[PDB]
Every structure is written in structure tokens, then in C-alpha cells.
Design a protein around this ligand. Sequence first.
Ligand SMILES: N#C[C@H](O)c1ccccc1Cl
Ligand SMILES: N#C[C@H](O)c1ccccc1Cl
Ligand SMILES: N#C[C@H](O)c1ccccc1Cl
Ligand SMILES: N#C[C@H](O)c1ccccc1Cl
Ligand SMILES: N#C[C@H](O)c1ccccc1Cl
Ligand SMILES: N#C[C@H](O)c1ccccc1Cl
Lengths: 162, 162, 164, 162
Amino acid sequence: MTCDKLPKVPVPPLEEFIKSNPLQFAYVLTDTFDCTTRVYVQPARLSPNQAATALDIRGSRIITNDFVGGPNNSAILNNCTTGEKATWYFQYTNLNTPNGSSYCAYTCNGEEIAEYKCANNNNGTDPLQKQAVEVAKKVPNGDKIHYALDNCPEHHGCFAFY
Amino acid sequence: MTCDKLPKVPVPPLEEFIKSNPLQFAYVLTDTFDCTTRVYVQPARLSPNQAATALDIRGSRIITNDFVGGPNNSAILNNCTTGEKATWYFQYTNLNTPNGSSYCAYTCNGEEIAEYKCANNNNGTDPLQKQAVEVAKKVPNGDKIHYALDNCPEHHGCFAFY
Amino acid sequence: DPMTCDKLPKVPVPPLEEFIKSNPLQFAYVLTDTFDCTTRVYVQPARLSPNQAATALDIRGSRIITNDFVGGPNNSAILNNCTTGEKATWYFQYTNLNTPNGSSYCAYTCNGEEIAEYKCANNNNGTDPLQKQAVEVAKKVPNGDKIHYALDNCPEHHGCFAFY
Amino acid sequence: MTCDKLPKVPVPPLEEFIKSNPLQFAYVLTDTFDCTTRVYVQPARLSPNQAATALDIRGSRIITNDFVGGPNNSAILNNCTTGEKATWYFQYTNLNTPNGSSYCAYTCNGEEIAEYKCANNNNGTDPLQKQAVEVAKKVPNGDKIHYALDNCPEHHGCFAFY
Ligand SMILES: N#C[C@H](O)c1ccccc1Cl
Ligand SMILES: N#C[C@H](O)c1ccccc1Cl
Ligand SMILES: N#C[C@H](O)c1ccccc1Cl
Ligand SMILES: N#C[C@H](O)c1ccccc1Cl
Ligand SMILES: N#C[C@H](O)c1ccccc1Cl
Ligand SMILES: N#C[C@H](O)c1ccccc1Cl
């Protein structure tokens, strides 16, 4: 019921995320991540630190964050444009089931939730995702968590991009 | 000698491209693909057509194109914002060698080259890439082909994105 | 250097007289194909206009698109399409009007962080160095890859310099 | 009473016409210039001949004519689309009074009036315009001269254009 107290499941291996690509966010907190597709990328061959990268794609705009594993099943995201760091966790993951992939992740401002991202590739049918969203919405600031896919731009022949 | 007569090698399996991710374009024709990172994405689980997607990323800007195989070792790209189609070929591919990946790809305007993209993840050291560029530069419009990675924006903690 | 449309420069809108003294201009770079082969003429408000909105005329042969405009906050102009009633909020990336080498500017309207339309006008055959740097910057924002040179393969004139 | 004998007042300086912009035609002869707004444009900076241009605007359509001074207080118009020439005169002008601007202009087919255009930006209140029209109507073919602004298309937020 406070953000610091939410579940922290192990971060799955990178290949599980790459196999899930692409995902879309069904629920988010700030309207930044509305109408958004997530793609995970392995580190560049010549990258010395070997950090993987999350791509958050909204139409023709992309947000990029390198990420590396931290303590307490955290990931630390490095905004590629800004240099800003955030500590993220998974509330749960459920990748590459026979009904597809879902997960919900979050980052905190102490006991409040600063950002929330629930991703899937199965149109929101995972029963885990339903229960996770209910829990998150009761954490302080969680009232802003909303369905992210309601009035999105029309497509021009691509399924996952517009 | 003319664009319509350039080599057209078989398109590698999608897995070989995804294993190469991310790449950058070392040589391009127009200014569009300067300072750009390419990421290949598989089709969304629920996509009926199962077209894969090419992501061309330059800072906060992304250009997206679904692609499918066509005749004569072609790929037909569908621009995801416009629905415009372009027929592309590979001049050569050399993916996932012990020295990394490279390829050069092109699209024609009759006998002229309209666009050219040479990708790698090994800082331009594949000897195939140098010979391919020297050939393409001699095709009509090919004089515009240029090194694409001078004076690109500075990074903020990520190796492959900015 | 600025990475999204919402972050582009917003210079002060010059007095309308500076635009009218620049008439007519042509668009060298645009985003959609609507404003290819296009000449711009600025018109003061009609004497009897209730709101004193000036008008931008975008002329392409025998066709015209018209937008009333008025000043808004943050150096914006709010445009009112006279045919449709559609409104849009425009800014100037830069203006360089009435120099000893003529006039140029680049203006834009955003769809949030993407550029929705772009219009680089001049009357000096695209020689202003500001215009080159501006175009390069605007192309790099989301959707800016569509910005193109607008004056290739336009219809032949019949004896008028600026209209066809 | 004959078109060739109508008054031919001096063509005012272009600046006086530009200061009057925009005008509308209250009376015209043919159907062509019903529901029409007139805007005058100076020559382009790079025009070698330095001819100004009259813009006749009717919704989304425009007729354009460069014009230059000729003998007898004439203007010679050059249609920018068709190349057609016509010799025009002013019956009177009354630009930039404290009650706004009006004028009446004409072109002849010998003794007949071929086209007539009375412009104003004061809703037709200049007494000169009334007397001019009554005179022109008595010229051969002047029976066709009519009020031009009756059943005009509805507007969408602009005063002078639709
Ligand atoms: N598979 C799947 C989802 O339907 C989807 C739709 C649009 C964009 C991305 C995704 Cl994953
Ligand atoms: N590996 C590698 C390359 O150096 C590189 C640098 C920057 C962006 C992408 C790539 Cl592939
Ligand atoms: N459309 C358009 C113009 O080029 C413009 C840009 C910015 C402010 C006003 C105007 Cl009319
Ligand atoms: N002055 C000038 C330009 O060359 C020009 C050519 C054609 C139409 C308009 C303009 Cl401004
Ligand atoms: N109204 C009118 C005429 O067509 C005209 C246009 C420009 C200059 C002179 C004249 Cl008479
Ligand atoms: N001022 C004035 C006139 O009433 C007018 C109305 C509509 C279009 C143009 C003009 Cl000048």
C-alpha cells in the first residue's frame, strides 16, 4: 500500500525480454507513456559496460534508457538524452507464456509511485496484470494510473508502429 | 555501374539481424540517416501479417518501416507513418562474423540510387564495406554517398543512443 | 541541438509591416507536400474586420489556402483556416526580414513533440545562411525527416515571375 | 455612353493599392468575379521586370494578373496562368479616404464594356461608386453589370476569405 513496499520479483534474463518484443503499455502513471510500444535492445558489440537499452516509442518520438541490474532485484535506468537515473522494480513478470507476455514495473518517490508501466503483447488478458494494477492504484499517487491505449493515432499499414 | 544492376544477395533470416542489434550507418546517401542507429524488431505476437520492423533512431527521432520479402531478393518496406512502399536490396551482407556484422543496402530510382545504407557494429573495419561503397559511389547519384558519423551529438551515459 | 518540436526556438513575431514589405515570398522547405511550389503573400486585416486578424495566403497556381492569424502567448500565432475553421498554433524558428540580401524565415507548428508542418520562406533563392542551419535543426525533431526541398519540378510560368 | 469614351483617371501609386488591401468587388459584369476578394502584391525582390500582381481570390481559387502602366492612364494585365493580355482603365479611384477605399475599373471590347470591377472596403458607401455604376450600366453590354456579393458561400472564422 506504499511504493517502497511493493513486490520486487527477479529481473528475467535479457533474452526473455527480447523474445517478448514488441510490447505496448496498457497502464501507465504519467501521460508520457501513453500510446507507446516498448522494444528491448541488447548492448552494442563494442559497448564496454554492456548495458542493454529500453526503447519507448510513441509514434515518431523515441525515449531511450540504458539499464543495468542493481540490488534488491532493481534495475537502474540511465536516460540517454538527459543522463538522469531512476531505480526501477518489477511488481511481477510473466514473459513468453502460451498466451504471450505481460509485466508491471514501477519507480518510487519514497512511499509514492513516481512512474508505472504495465506492458503486454496479448491485449491485457493476463489475470496477473489485472490484480497488479488494482494493488498499484492504492499506493500514494497511484490514482493517476490510467489505461494508456484509448485514443491513439491511426496507423498506416504497420501493426505495432504509427 | 547503374543502380538496377547492383548485386542482390539473399536477405538473411530475421534472427541474424536481431542478433546483430544494434547497428549504426557508416555510409549513407541522403542526410536523413546521418548519426543513426538501426534496430530490427520481430512482428508483434498478434500481427496478422507477421511483418518485421526496421527502427531508424537518431536522437529522439525514430523512423519506422515494416518490411517483407519480395522477388529478386528484395525487401518491400512500408513506412509506418505514410504507407509509402520502397523496394530495397542488399548489395552484400556479412552478419555475426567473429569481427561483428556489416551490410550495405540500397533502393533505386531507375538507374540512379535513391538511398544507400551501410550498417555495421565494428566501427567500419569490414573490408567488404570499403569495396561496396567504392562500387556504389560510381552509380548515378552515388557521388552523394558519404561518411555518416562525423560531428554527431555528444552522448549522456549511453553508448549507442543520445 | 533542440531534440523535440516543443523545444524549438520561438523568436518574437516581427511587426506585420516587415512581412508585407517582404511580399511575395516562396517556400524553399516544407514538411507535407501541400506547400510545394507555393508562394506566400501576407495581407493586413480588412478595414471592417471585427477581430483585426491579418491573413496568410498560400498560393499554388490557381489554388489558394488562406489562414487568418492573431498573436498569442510565447511568441505564438494562432492560425484559423478560412475554409475549414481548423486552428493551429505556429511559431517562428527564426526570422531575418528585409536584410540587404532580402528576407527569410522558418516557421513551424507542432503535434506535441513532433513537427506537424514546417514552412521556410524566402525571396533570395535560399541564400540566407540562417535558413540552412534552421532546416538541419528542424529535420532532427520527431517527424522532421519529411521536411524537403519544395521547389523542384514545379509547373512552367506563363509570363509572370512569381505566379503561374 | 460608349466604353471607349469612359473616364480614364491616373493609376494611383502601388503603395495606395497595397494600403487598401484587401478589397471586395461590389459590382462586376461577368460571373467570374462574383464573391471575390482583391489583394495587390508588389513585384518579387528578384523580378527583372518589376511588374506588380493583382490577386483575385474566390474561396480556394485564385486568378492572378501581373500589371504594368501603359498609355492613356491604362494598365496592361498579363494573366499568369493563360498569358492573356487586357487593357484596363480606372473610371475613378478614391483610395484611403477616412471612410476607406473604392474604385471602378473596366476593359473594353471597342464600344462595348467587356469587364467591369468596382472594389471597396467600406460596404459600398462611397457616393462616387453609385454614380459610376449608373454610368457604366448605360454603356453597351453594361446591362449585365450586377451586385456581386449576394448569395456568397458561408465563412468559417475569417472575415475576408472563405
Ligand atoms: N501483439 C500485440 C499488441 O497488440 C500490440 C499492438 C500495437 C503495438 C504493439 C503491440 Cl505489442
Ligand atoms: N558496437 C558498436 C558501434 O560503435 C556503435 C556506436 C554507437 C551506436 C551504435 C553502434 Cl552499433
Ligand atoms: N503557416 C504559416 C506561416 O509560415 C506563419 C508562421 C508563424 C507565424 C505566423 C505565420 Cl502566418
Ligand atoms: N524574389 C524571388 C523568388 O525568386 C521567387 C520566385 C518565384 C515566386 C516567388 C518568389 Cl519570392
Ligand atoms: N480591378 C481591377 C483591374 O483588373 C486592375 C488591376 C490592377 C491594376 C489596374 C487595374 Cl484597372
Ligand atoms: N473591409 C471590408 C469588406 O467588408 C470586406 C468583406 C469581405 C471580404 C473583403 C472585404 Cl474588403
